[model samples]
Target: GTSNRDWWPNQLDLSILHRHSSLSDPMGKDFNYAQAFEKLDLAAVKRDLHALMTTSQDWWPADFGHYGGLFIRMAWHSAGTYRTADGRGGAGEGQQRFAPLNSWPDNANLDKARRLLFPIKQKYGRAISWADLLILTGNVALESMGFKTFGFAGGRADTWEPEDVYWGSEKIWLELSGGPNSRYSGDRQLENPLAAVQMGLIYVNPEGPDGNPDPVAAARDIRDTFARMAMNDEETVALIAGGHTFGKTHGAGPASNVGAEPEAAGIEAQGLGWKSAYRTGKGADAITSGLEVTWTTTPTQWSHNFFENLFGYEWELTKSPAGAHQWVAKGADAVIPDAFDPSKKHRPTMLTTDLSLRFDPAYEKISRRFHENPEQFADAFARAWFKLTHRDMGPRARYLGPEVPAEVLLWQDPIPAVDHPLIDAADAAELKAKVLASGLTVSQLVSTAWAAASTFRGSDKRGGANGARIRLAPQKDWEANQPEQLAAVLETLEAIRTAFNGAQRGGKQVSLADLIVLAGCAGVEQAAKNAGHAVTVPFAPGRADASQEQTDVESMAVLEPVADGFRNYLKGKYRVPAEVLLVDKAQLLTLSAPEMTVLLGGLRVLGANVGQSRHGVFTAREQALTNDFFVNLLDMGTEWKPTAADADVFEGRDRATGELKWTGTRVDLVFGSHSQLRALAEVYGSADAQEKFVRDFVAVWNKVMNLDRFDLA
Candidate 1:
């Protein structure tokens, strides 16, 4: 029971994290795109995922009722929303947060999965997209049981309102009006965009061939859903066996809440992990799908046990009055556990879909291969999961960092909360001690402090508003003129330097180009938290400080935008070429479109004087870490100023009152101008999008902070 960081080697040790050909299926050839190896902090993501499932007092152990099953179920629903024809919906949009989408009758208590994982969202921020998070948690859970599921990537942007879902013209995955076990080719209306999410539930509720469904319903639902996703018969069987390995259909033992909160979870909440309780019912007669049967003898682990059991025996149809289509053991020994005895002949229970695998010749072939070779089963399932989760997005999926070592104890330990360092003596003393004990390179030391340093320089009208060129010699000395912000930052850096005692890697001192940014990060983090800004100020250390030889004053000027390349200034003081304006800001600062948007939004919200005024968009919350800037963009109307003073600049006016509300720099306007940026802005602008915006902003903001730390040993 003792915890060892070594038990689960660093996630990096588990697999090769280098660039390699992706493991894909035939459907991949349907779409032409190349998969690039993405760098991600697999360890952090896994640890965060583990914390999401097990942190609560109502924890479920793997040996006990494994709650991981519910997460797998949640992932199933999230990916099940995908439609192949036009490529929309899926976990990519995170539309499940909306009505009918979230409230679908079939999704039922899935709110518990969202609720349980919300804390992880807060702590890890948006480096883990909600869509990706759903899939990652499931993979992490499966991998915890020694099953190597597919790798994960981020960049799945959460869609705004249900209306934002690109209502595809193709009507493939529609529902039919039928009984609980009804399946026939029918075109249900494609009117509501949320209807797709509803379609997913309908397809799932009427147990497929595995359950004793109308035999027509058996393989058809799987064919319809998986076929739309471009999965073949083999991938479909692999996905089913893999997903079915965990969780129980019947409400056995304690209810494992799969939604947000366990206590508030519905009574019908499904129990997680593996249990075989083959009883008819207790209260409800409508529960025909509750034929209890654990698919695998080792239910918690992932293997070909489901296929092995399926091919091994002939299951007799259940004669229960409830008309449940499930099968029971045929022999006399079947009535008990392990058919009553572990060593005795085992009678396995199966759903119509499970039986369909054996009954259908094509499916039976694939099933036999998996039964013969478990490795083939796992490989197929991993690729299917990869395809399922990555529904809409192509090869452009984003990743975070290096693979984190697997830490099993992460499940039991509380997620490490980001400490909000204040500017007081006590906090500084604590930080000093950490810096000394950390053995952290100087690059990492300053790397953590840079975001706070450069965040305030987004003004297009005022050249480098306050030159954010951190670490440059003449610039650092000139920065003394604005000592109010720099003084506190310098103190933190000095303390760190003193602790280092001239710690050097090669022949150089650890205090160079990286020092300023690192200290700036420290100062910004401390200042924001001390001032009560509720935003997450993330800090990571590793980037080495650049030497004087690396500093380029002219290139640095380009990196420090003269005008918010994202905004349109009235005066055109620092004009960006129209071509460069639209394209990823020319990667001058090595920031992505999303990163630039988030950082600019953060800068404006931080009371950085943009073009004219910040009062309107941010209001009094300028000092607070909030998405009110986005909330205003959605709420207020903007106008190209006919104002006597300025004709070019835009002003945000209160929508209801029609009064002049606020005027931000040109940079703030791009979020509303560009289609790609606008989509993200629209989500953050919505009232409920705060958590999403915050998580996303912090994740990108962390990236923006370390633009120049190229050489770290």
Candidate 2:
């Protein structure tokens, strides 16, 4: 249960840089899930899923004689974890099957949902991933229950559990009593990159903020959390109302009667927990969310009852049988039937969050409109649900399946298809020569290209150099891109692009997008040549230019770098360490430990530091693309000490005499300080590793430039 390395508390953790390594994956390198899924009998998988919804087992019985509500909850929880801040969570990876999520109080009993789908998963094996299956099953469940979904697109490949997501800093789960563990600061402000109101919850607490029943406050929390997921007011109302239209909340008894979560359960529990001792603890006896209530009489079909019931009755504050806060209509004429028992009937009930739509002024207006028009509500729900599930999937080109909609959406970051013939090898060679002789420094070309491409986060697959969006409004003006220098570089590249395109025949042309990346490739080659090694950095053509109309300025703003380690740029001082932020950025770039090491080393020697700072330039020969940064960093002659002005800055002085030899930031020294990074640094610093370093650097440089090329993938 323990390792020898656990004893070292001060060691910089490089585990974040080593996630999803080949060793952890059982599927070999050749396995491609998308291609495999193409061979799957999709219709048959849906048939089995529909049959399983109606076919119930005695161990864990389905509510209302159908599993429609349960499956919807499972999928909702899975995808609802996504927030637009860093774009980390979501159903994209089927992460709900693992710890923290599998055991979350908000995600209670979802483990049973996955277990129910095992038969379908077993039948299709590698042809279908659990990630794809989870979202697809939800779509199937909705369609079977009479809801027309907007569309479905498969192609979500599953991976093992990730260790880098910052859920919160609380030591205990669901600590809503707000003390030192509270995530909120002044005036109910949730922390940055965290959208949830509490730990162990996906969004706001269903009972209300901190379990206190205040509809107005609950509405505020819902608005903030949903907005963080990139949802607007109309979509937010549709999701809340549409989701509650089918399911019944379970809270038949007190929460104490339930057992521990899956991760904390004993061996005999067999990866399943929340075992209740009240009655049989099967259907009606289950305790989840500690609020047992059905929103409508028809619990297995799509209906307008969610808004109808929410607006029809006068609701008063009340508590569930499990002592959780809820609302009950006063003198309700209609009664909802028990899910499992046919003879019993109870008054319709609602969660505090549900009443928020009616009580809050702005939400009340949207709810009233949705209630007046059922058809409009259905369409809104369908589209919002589709966006909820597919938002993290990046470009439309990555979407696979027969059900994918033909309509292009703005949220997809639409890029026009290449219509004209791309430049040939001769054209590329001519352009490279022109770009090299264009009077731009290697640092300018390389840094500008990096600013464009490094925005491509593997988390949500957003941003990249493909659209050349760095020339647009928000990206061009971003502080991290160094606006003045970026403007100058783009101006020079535009001139070259104009001249080259005017010279082409037969409609063969070059795009500004292609020119930006090609310029970086040419610059890197020259840098390597100056280091006594000749290398041709790989470049792929056919990238298209996107106008400001095609780009969403607000959406793209979230991808801006708050702190970038490679360029040694910090927007401002943060509570998080600079080195930790560096690892976060590297992880988003999808670089392995060695790849991250080699790229940082190459960028430093190439003098690509932000604002022309020389903090990480370890070599006398700038822009040579050598291994001197690594070699000098591991040198024993330098005595490193923190600079008095700024703790983040450090000075390396001569060990024998009191003379400053070099200066660097935490991002530079981290390579020598961390055991794993230090080991990688030693490999590149060795006398025989000069050629290997340059080769590896070029390979990684090409990899980053092509990360958003779904067409190539």
Candidate 3:
């Protein structure tokens, strides 16, 4: 069976998810919630990272022990595989863990780099993913090199194996055009240029007919190849220059005496041969056959030296004692420095492609600017570097970018907040069917249950942990519970639970509170299914119940509304305006501005937008789980007319519903009014972002339901 089926745009594939299960399985024996779902100890990773780079024993002069260079290569190879159109092959999937990637010639020497990371992976398997580790290691290296880079977040979980990965070979590299949707060349064989550079193949060499150093053609190839991965002109120059900062090519010229034979080492020999047959022969000396030379004299630090050297000195292609055409310093630039001179006054050797950056007008403009203003280059390089590493994450991917300060943040934790055992296959299927037929919609059950559960064992202030205890007293007055309508909903929930408990057959045990939450989850699944929304919102069972003593009157008052976040409170001693009430509700729930907007957005459409208190209703299609809530709210053509009596209440006529019966709450107006919330509202409100709205909405919805659970702590 196919592991990843393309379902409703961003729906979670169970087949793929199932593979992540089986913690006892040999594949992911180290996997667990603490490592995979909790905040990671990024400090420890950074600490170990500093030691790994500075250790003298592992150091190599040809590339600073190949530390920063190799890590950068890993990050680039992983990110370079991304294709924006299909939204596939991101660093998140860990595609390199298997497949054609493991054996692909483009990634020839990278195994050694990956192997170096294996120990780190074993010690921190749960803390970070291989993909995040690669990028994190590279970013750390850059920081250690005295460049400022934002610290990385670590909550990424590696996919067991993805359905597709970039599969290609060197033969395909020669024939294919690096154009739109051209990453794989349709022939299942292609050479990844990012991988090629790391493998020490072609850099300054031409569009090779088949190995000549065509400077002009080389410039065009650089642009075309990078564009395939969505990098632009400025980003391209930045990445190229930044990547060249820490590595020296071996086997050619300056490096001929520094290392082993070309082929025996990891460098490719195909494009390294020169026009001279004797000098270019397979067994010929590496110094004579390839364009191998240091681009920068100081290869250990982050510097503008690559750009400075490329432009400051006059260069000429020289055929050394060996045979390849590589650039070398002439006259004043020709003095090679002693092994470790500080100023590093020496002629820089550049590949023909490195020199091409100056030969092309557009590329030259950026290269010149970067050399003059080092900070300007650093800023842009940082941005492009961050972008490359994050390109493959889908729109719904949690934003753990540099925008958030790193010291305060660590690895991002996955959803479900609590560790939940898998629901038994047979029992889960039947219970799912029972809940769907329980005369309640998923959104209804979710909202009603969440509202009721909010006050369980809560303080006088607001809601807190005391898992779903609404099943205890259906007729009792739960005053703080907003909407008041949920009293009846809870009755139905308990009725369904009673019948469900009776019908329970042999399987893993479940708490009553757990079943209540499951019912809510099942309701959501049912509605999403009906609406043709193909997302799989997570539903973790096994919630432990609160004792009867904990559910007494004073403790249960916490479940009641404190002003109210999602709705206008009832008129009484604690009465407040809808706006003030919403503020209280938001504070009570601890939701972000965006999180609050989507929950209310979903509530309005989930049939909560009706009557006196339910005024913020945006859509007329009641009980719908579609993106209509966002679409209609963002549409400028629609106007909100305030009601004559309550200035807080506004109305809008649905095109489908005649006259002027439609309405909106004052709180709902805030989504369209406030700038920050409005921007996100406008996005979710768009027709094009329906899938995005669905994905984002479910995440927030799940969080809201888990608000009372202490598992998060």
Candidate 4:
């Protein structure tokens, strides 16, 4: 695993990667939109997906639990799936699977990455939850790999085709706003206006569906369930209007932290990768050229960690002889064909350990989790897998999202203590010897030496600013109640609030404590006003249920203990650090696929989140229910053509012989419902409580997705 040179085979191998389509229900339409074989190149995408997943700890037998970064990388890249043209929008058939991204020219040997879940839309239909799914996927992977949990908003508008990037418009994804997106449905709610992300769906055509996931059927679902969670509490807004923070903050104290590039006036606006001191990264603070002018965090990256990743420069679509990749070392620009050639202006790539580490901009870049601390990552991931996916009912099991009174549980404790290189002693010796033979010491013949983040940063030789200071800034547009899609956002906000008000069981109103916690959220609203630095806010999100409304005395006891400890720490003895908050807004912004690829996966060490021993129960009876209750029950000779002989094997011989003793193939219909978020909210407190919030969110999502009547339910 020491940065292997060979990452993929010439042809796509689905068998090796466990890449296969889900079986169709006996109901005829095998749901999922990725079935674009009408002369489409999706098959190739599937092949690449297999390579990426198998290459890392996805399904391969490499080790136990070391897959947090890999999972983050998957959600980051797959987030770019949606495309747009007429009104229809969805992640294109794995167009990146065949070539270009699959075999980026700039990023060398990066021809292994592929489009994942491309067929998901086809099977699941347009009702697929976009933002919710994206955020949930990110959380699940991170938690499954031993990382803290998190969440994001839903309501991401899908594009129609994948050709937008091919057209050189990094603005490939249009926020259902009207500005340049004139072709969409005048449901100008999404198009033609900049506003808080609303819960309403923006139809590509005037005649499209208008609610949540299930274009035609799910309008009422969001109005009834998910909407309350995302927008119920008059969301707080903070700003970080500065996208130029990219080159401002670099390295920590003892070293020349500032990168060569500066964040003055207008800059290249391009991002590096990894969570570093210098890079502004593509996390929650990403911004594009045109986007910087008025965008609230231009590219709406959910995780604040992305700001650090930008300095690292990580891209998902890489260039190489084969295609884009998930795991590898080579690749130049991170693209394929001539895209990898930075000199040619086709910086096809964004970041990678081997590829970007050598780029001029890259020198001190860090590797993704598994590549960094395999043991830690594996352990954490295994725990996360257990916690995020299962519903643990044990007394010791602390539910996600919900926390004990005054619990200050920390996750992703990102503090620079001591740096440990992934290279083994033998590998280091070999590298040293090779460098010595080449007439230069290991220090001399190295790809990255600038010691900033990665080679990708070195390649970006953009100027650095001396006056650049980092701080927590809020988005500028959070206050703007108008623009291309503002009206829609505002309207959606109202609808969601109303729905939430209606959904509530009692008159338990929003509280001041909620405001205190929410006050820390800094997002698009602040960015729109022009926030200009990197800063950490203290806060975390979670959920809680009836069972968690503990005894008043017990709650006070837990609260007082932590309160006293914090007071002592902050004042004298321990001086526990003040945690930063980075939430309190409605919707985040939009970002390019590459930007997402760069962030969301840097330096993540998935550690065991509390209450997840039962999460990894994918092999339990309930999971099998998905296959047996629905898949097997719905098999009507559609997944595979049943020939006459095959039919004979399952014939109702008992009926013909009047013996009632035959194993017939006539499938029976058995419908069932999935658990509801309301039921789950019972455990997960709202965001700001703990990682359990996301854990609970994803748990419900998974169970619902696997249910036979999930769509209807």
TM-scores, in order shown? 0.43, 0.98, 0.47, 0.19
Q: Estimate the TM-score for candidate 2.
A: 0.98
When summed lDDT is taken over every stretch of 10 residues in candidate 2, the lowest stretch is 4-13
User: What is the per-residue lDDT of model 3 for residues 383-415, given as tens digits with 9 covering 90 to 100?
Assistant: 777767765442112434333333221111111
- Give the better candidate number (1 or 3) by TM-score: 3
- Over 1-713, each residue of candidate 2 has an lDDT whose tens digit, in order, gives 67645787545567777778788999989999889988888999999999998998889898988999999999999999998999989988888998878999998888899999998899889999999999999999999899999999989998886547888889888887467867888888888898898888988988888888999989999999999999988999999999999978888888889999999999999999898898998687888888977998788888898888898889888888899989888998657988887988888889989998998999899899999998999999999999999999988889998899988877888888999998988889999999999888888889988998999998888989988899998999999999999999999999999999998889999989989999999989999988899888889998888889998888888999989999989999898788888888988999888999999999998878888898989999998989999999999999999988988899999999979989999999999898888999999999999999999999999999999999888
lDDT of 3 at 129: 71
The best candidate by lDDT is 2
List candidate 1 segments past 4 Å from native. Answer: 1-42, 51-63, 163-217, 251-291, 319-323, 332-347, 397-713
lDDT for each candidate structure: 0.49, 0.90, 0.56, 0.22
| Order of models, best lDDT first | 2, 3, 1, 4
Instruction: For each of the candidates, give the backbone clash count.
Output: 46, 0, 20, 195
TM-score of 3: 0.47
Per-residue lDDT over 153-247 for candidate 1, one digit per residue giving the tens place of the 0 to 100 score:
55554434452233333333234434342333255322322223224353443444333365445666556556655467888888888887765
Residue-wise C-alpha lDDT for candidate 4, range 1-713, written one tens digit per residue: 54222553322111211122123222235533222222233334334333433233231221111222333433433322221111011221223332233322111111111123334334444543332233344454443333443232222223222222211112433223333533223332322111112211211111112211222232222122212111110110000111111111111121122122211212442222112242332221221110111111112222322223333444343222212122222343422222112233222222221222223221222223323443443343333322222211112222222211232211211111112222233432333233233332111111011001110100001101100000001110212111223233223323433443354453422221111112212221121112222222222212111112122222111111111110111112222121100000000101121111111110000101011121111112321111122222122332322237653123222223344221321111001111221222223222342333223322322221121111121
- The better candidate by TM-score, 2 or 3, is 2
